Amino acid sequence: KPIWEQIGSSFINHYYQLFDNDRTQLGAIYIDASCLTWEGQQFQGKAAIVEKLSSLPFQKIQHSITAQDHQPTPDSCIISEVVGQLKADEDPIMGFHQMFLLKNINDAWVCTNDMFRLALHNF
Amino acid sequence: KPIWEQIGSSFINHYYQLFDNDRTQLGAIYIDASCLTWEGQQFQGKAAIVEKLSSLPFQKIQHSITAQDHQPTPDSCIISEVVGQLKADEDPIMGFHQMFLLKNINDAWVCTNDMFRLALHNF
């Protein structure tokens, strides 16, 4: 795998790792200019984004990835796509799709753009 | 609508008009560094993208957008997300998801990163 795939796959892994153990720690991977579109709702900046994710009414959450793709961009960013399922407490299993735009700032890969959508009908 | 939504939306609309009515003209929206991932397979560079699009086995296709989201990025690009359905010739209706990274180059909006995937779930 090319370097953008190694970085992206690793960022994806670390992201869900954090999200699934303590989403209040996701601030380390967003910056003030970060944009998040979560089920059509928009949020900008590390504070507002973490607040939104933290507000999700779940105690236990687990992401399982069924597919991911990564590409390099001309401004040296990495764009990543992920599809999978999520198990939050006793809720029925739900499919999700997520997109990330990554940029290296201050020698750290951060997410500048995040778009998340859930499957309307699940098995 | 914010400017990034107006531009992303018109680009999306244009891309599908081209795809559904004259796909041989799709190369015009890409540049040499553009990258495409088609149903999980990678085509890096305009030449490979163009050849792959030219190879599509369908004679006629129709796309219908059901949802879209757009965001501005720090380097002034626009990241777009499209959810919809598509029907090719006699194949059954299928769900799809597509992501586009847009950048104004030589003062024209072009797509630098394109990720297309068929979808079994309705996002």
Curated annotation (Swiss-Prot), chains A, B:
Keyword flag Zinc-finger: no
GO MF terms held by the record: identical protein binding; nuclear import signal receptor activity; small GTPase binding; structural constituent of nuclear pore
Result of altering D114N: Decreased interaction with GDP-bound RAN. No effect on interaction with nucleoporins. No effect on proteins nuclear import
Residue numbers of N6-acetyllysine PTMs: K1
Domain NTF2: 7-118
A biological-process GO annotation: mRNA transport
Localization per Swiss-Prot or TrEMBL: Cytoplasm, Cytosol; Nucleus outer membrane; Nucleus, Nuclear pore complex; Nucleus inner membrane
GO CC annotation: cytosol; nuclear inner membrane; nuclear membrane; nuclear outer membrane; nuclear pore central transport channel; nucleoplasm
Effect of D20 to A/N: No effect on interaction with GDP-bound RAN. Increases GDP-bound RAN nuclear import. Increased interaction with nucleoporins and localization to the nuclear pore complex
Main subcellular location: cytoplasm
Keyword line: Acetylation, Cytoplasm, Membrane, mRNA transport, Nuclear pore complex, Nucleus, Protein transport, Translocation, Transport
Job of this protein: Mediates the import of GDP-bound RAN from the cytoplasm into the nucleus which is essential for the function of RAN in cargo receptor-mediated nucleocytoplasmic transport. Thereby, plays indirectly a more general role in cargo receptor-mediated nucleocytoplasmic transport. Interacts with GDP-bound RAN in the cytosol, recruits it to the nuclear pore complex via its interaction with nucleoporins and promotes its nuclear import.
SUBUNIT field: Homodimer. Interacts with RAN (GDP-bound form); the interaction is direct and regulates RAN nuclear import. Interacts with the nucleoporins NUP54, NUP58 and NUP62 (via FG repeats); recruits NUTF2 to the nuclear pore complex a step required for NUTF2-mediated GDP-bound RAN nuclear import. Interacts with CAPG; mediates its nuclear import.
Entry protein name: Nuclear transport factor 2
Source organism (scientific name): Rattus norvegicus (Rat)
Gene that produces this protein: Nutf2
